[PDB]
Amino acid sequence: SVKSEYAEAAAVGQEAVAVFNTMKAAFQNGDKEAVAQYLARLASLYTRHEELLNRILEKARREGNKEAVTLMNEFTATFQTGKSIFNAMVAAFKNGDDDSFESYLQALEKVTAKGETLADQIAKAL
Ligand SMILES: Nc1cccc(Oc2ccccn2)c1
């Protein structure tokens, strides 16, 4: 069902949270070889999550589930906010700009935390 597909998407999101916190520890310790690998891992994870979310939204639309569509349109928009911040973080890493990396890291955390009440609302709506 769309609901079990959302639970699968939610687990993929939690994997990115796990790899993100590990990466943050690695960055603070200056283990840039680890950070590079974790950033690659996170990129693939976000690509997957983004695809799952789009499929879920498209299915909610085909099902005429207006409330779930509204919530998923709001949540996907905020996902792109997180994604653009991630990508700028990756660029800051490539450039050796640790001040920007730190800024982007904290922002991506606040964007993610903010978008959690919505994420729980979608689970219930599908
Ligand atoms: N593409 C992308 C990459 C990193 C973080 C991010 O933020 C998120 C993740 C889930 C919900 C809201 N924002 C999105």
* Segments making up each domain of the chain, as ranges: 1-126
The two three-digit tokens of residue 55, written as one number: 């499929």
Residue having the nearest C-alpha atom to atom 6 of ligand 1: 82
Please give the method by which this entry was determined.
X-ray
The two three-digit tokens of residue 39, written as one number: 């950033």
CB 50: neighbour CB atoms within 10 A?
17
Give the integer Cα–Cα distance in Å for 67 and 8: 20
Q: What does DSSP assign to residue 1?
A: -
* Residue 63: its H or E element: none
Residue 104, ligand 1, Cβ within 6 A: no
Q: Which of 21, 41, 86, 118 to mutate to test the pocket of ligand 1 (most atoms within 8 A of CB)?
A: 86
Going by C-alpha positions, the residue among 86, 88, 92 that lies closest to residue 109 is 86
AA identity, residue 104: Y
In angstroms, this model's resolution equals 1.6
Give the integer Cα–Cα distance in Å for 51 and 103: 27
Give the integer Cα–Cα distance in Å for 52 and 67: 18
Residue 82, ligand 1, Cβ within 6 A: yes
Q: How far is the CA of 112 from the centre of ligand 1 (A)?
A: 6
